[PDB]
Amino acid sequence: STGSATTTPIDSLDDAYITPVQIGTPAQTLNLDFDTGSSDLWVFSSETTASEVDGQTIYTPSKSTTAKLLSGATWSISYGDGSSSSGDVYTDTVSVGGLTVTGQAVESAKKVSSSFTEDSTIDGLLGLAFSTLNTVSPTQQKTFFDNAKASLDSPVFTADLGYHAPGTYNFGFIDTTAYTGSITYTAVSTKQGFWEWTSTGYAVGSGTFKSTSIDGIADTGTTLLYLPATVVSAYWAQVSGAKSSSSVGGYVFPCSATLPSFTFGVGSARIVIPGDYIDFGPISTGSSSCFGGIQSSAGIGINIFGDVALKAAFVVFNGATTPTLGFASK
């Protein structure tokens, strides 16, 4: 089997992407944030504290003839950005782009943190990291991909995120029309539960390529590109007036600037992030200080190839017995 679904930016900055997901019988369609940095499929629901729901579409398990309470199971998650959610668990039928999993754990939120409430466009998350990170207790649950894998034509999914435009998540096949040149594959460590890999270096603009190993994760659920402070300083030094602002929480730059591109290495191959992808707009409405899309990972404890990086590539998440990651230009 295969599946194919369009993923759509939630706003004009590509702060996140939402993909429609069918849950239950009859289908309840919720728009979920597909997150290769976590491993829980959780939703706003009829159980979510009323004051914490603000415009989201909810899953109502009592209206699904295929929903079953997973008795005794609870979940609780905290994300790198300080947000969180928790609740109980149902199993139900879940379909993405025509690909159906029966008995998928659907984690129903009883509580969500303010960041989730305040984002009316995101009805929940669909985790696509390794199932070892799933938070369900006392019986850990599998991700949608892990459950689908054996049925797929090939044990893969691909992320093709758009810049200020829709893109595509495919399951079970590689669309050879969706990228240019060849796909370069690179090794993955699953030791921390992530799609963790090592970039071979970087360049800033038309500058020379610096060969250096950068360990990090491919994370569709993180907006920006978080890299070591040395790398990030080298980038922003090429933008007149750019500075790290402790008050704002990262690098800012004059909105009048033209940003240079940023290149990262995948083996001997190179992915070029155009400068415009690195512009996250005014820090507040009407400001002439703009927020940068490349930020320091110092104090996160891991480098993160988030959407800023991934949307410059066609990315293969290869879930074969020994997982790997593939990157192509597009």
Of the candidates 235, 194, 213, 224, the residue with the CA atom closest to the CA atom of residue 317 = 194
Sheet of strand 294-296, all strands in order from the earlier edge strand to the far edge: 269-273, 262-266, 196-204, 210-218, 303-305, 225-227, 294-296
Q: Name the domain boundary from 174, 199, 229.
A: 174
Q: Cα separation of 195 and 218, whole Å?
A: 6
Sequence-ordered list of residues with C-beta below 8 angstroms from that of 190, at least 6 positions apart, any chain: 130, 132, 196, 323
- Whether residue 195 is found in the same domain as residue 119: no
- What ranges in the chain are assigned the alpha helix state H? 114-118, 144-148, 229-236, 307-310
User: What does the DSSP 8-state code read for residue 246?
Assistant: T
- Whether residue 151 is found in the same domain as residue 203: no
3-state secondary structure of 188: coil
Q: Which residues partner with 217 through β-bridges?
A: 196, 304
Q: Name the domain boundary from 174, 196, 215.
A: 174
State the method.
Answer: X-ray
Q: Which residues partner with 94 through β-bridges?
A: 23, 101
DSSP string, 126-151: EE-S-GGG---BSS----HHHHHGGG
**Given the residues 35, 88, 160, 219, the one annotated as active site:** 35
- Whether residue 29 is found in the same domain as residue 135: yes
Q: Cα separation of 59 and 55, whole Å?
A: 13
Q: Name the domain boundary from 159, 174, 189.
A: 174
- Whether residue 48 is found in the same domain as residue 185: no
Query: Is residue 213 a contact partner of residue 198, using CB atoms and an 8 Å limit?
Result: yes
Q: How far apart are the first and last CA of the chain?
A: 25
State both tokens at 302: 């891991």
- Whether residue 87 is found in the same domain as residue 22: yes
- Whether residue 108 is found in the same domain as residue 38: yes
Task: Could you list the beta-strand ranges (E) of 148-195.
Answer: 156-160, 167-171, 184-187
The boundaries of the domain holding residue 327 are 175-330
Of the candidates 225, 232, 241, 242, the residue with the CA atom closest to the CA atom of residue 204 = 232
Q: Is 35 noted as a catalytic residue in this protein?
A: yes
Query: Is residue 240 a contact partner of residue 259, using CB atoms and an 8 Å limit?
Result: no
Query: Is residue 32 a contact partner of residue 43, using CB atoms and an 8 Å limit?
Result: yes
Query: Is residue 74 a contact partner of residue 166, using CB atoms and an 8 Å limit?
Result: no
- Whether residue 181 is found in the same domain as residue 159: no
DSSP string, 26-78: TTEEEEEEEETT---EEE-BTTS-GGG-SS---B-GGG-TT-EEEEEEEEEEE
- Whether residue 181 is found in the same domain as residue 168: no
- Whether residue 186 is found in the same domain as residue 327: yes
3-state secondary structure of 309: helix
Query: Is residue 18 a contact partner of residue 33, using CB atoms and an 8 Å limit?
Result: yes
Rounded (5°) CA angle 281-283-288: 75
Query: Is residue 122 a contact partner of residue 27, using CB atoms and an 8 Å limit?
Result: no
- Whether residue 11 is found in the same domain as residue 151: yes
Q: Given CA atoms 6, 183, 192, 157 in this order, what sign does their dihedral have?
A: positive
Exposure b/e, 213-242, CB count within 10 A at least 16 = b: ebebbbbbbbbbbbbbeebbebbbebbeeb
- Whether residue 73 is found in the same domain as residue 150: yes
Q: Cα separation of 173 and 189, whole Å?
A: 22
Q: Cα separation of 265 and 262, whole Å?
A: 10
Q: Is 151 noted as a catalytic residue in this protein?
A: no
**Given the residues 199, 261, 296, 297, the one annotated as active site:** 199
- Whether residue 187 is found in the same domain as residue 130: no
Q: Cα separation of 145 and 47, whole Å?
A: 26
Tell me how many domains the chain contains.
2
CATH number, domain at 181?
Answer: 2.40.70.10
State both tokens at 228: 């070591």
